[PDB]
Amino acid sequence: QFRHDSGYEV
């Protein structure tokens, strides 16, 4: 509800 794909990897 805040930012899509927020659990992005590095």
Epitope: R3, H4, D5
Partner: antibody, heavy 119, light 113 residues
Framework: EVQLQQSGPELVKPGASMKISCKAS????????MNWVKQSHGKNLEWIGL????????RYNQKFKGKATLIVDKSSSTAYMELLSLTSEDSAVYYC????????????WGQGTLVTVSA | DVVMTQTPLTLSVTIGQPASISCKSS???????????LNWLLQRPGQSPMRLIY???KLDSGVPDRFTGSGSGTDFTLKISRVEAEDLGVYYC?????????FGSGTKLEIKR
Amino acid sequence: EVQLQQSGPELVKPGASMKISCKASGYSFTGYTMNWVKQSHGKNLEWIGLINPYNGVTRYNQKFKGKATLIVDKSSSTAYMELLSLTSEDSAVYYCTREAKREWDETYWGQGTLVTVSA
Amino acid sequence: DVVMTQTPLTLSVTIGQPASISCKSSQSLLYSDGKTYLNWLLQRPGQSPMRLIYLVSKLDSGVPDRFTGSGSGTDFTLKISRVEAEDLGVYYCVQGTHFPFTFGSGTKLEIKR
């Protein structure tokens, strides 16, 4: 369909630690990041942190560092938030939410869990 | 942290009349990918919050076309072209561009009759 079913309300004593659960169903659990949100007195909303169940990435609001611990149980498609060292000000409604993966994805909220910290 | 300032605190509108509410951020919500992660939520009496608008102006599925979001940078606006009784509740803006994500303190829409 997609549902986020949270723990029922809890009475917990100050100084204990206690777990909230958020059981996800209707979608690929590891495909979406889960967020946790605090709402005090039906007023202000605060973002606690997020956890990506696929890769274990876990980001916290620094305000809640050392108060909340986020884990997942992929086997049961359940997200958990541990609330540590409980005090009166942890009394609140806690929500889990499912984030979008693609831009066009729907987002979802659990029904909330009312925590009362009291002796 | 990004401070989200919503005005007014409450808005009272007659059925059929327009509504406008403001959300201002203390920092730009423009992210490095060119997108602006500003969202509008509505929390109705007794319910969980639900998102109505994302990326400033995109309507979530099922949301009436009476709702429009606009803005850029640090100044954002939610408008209702004609208010219906079912629109009442508390409207929150929430930003997802900067960690930690932060919410406005809400505008309560009240219906006049």
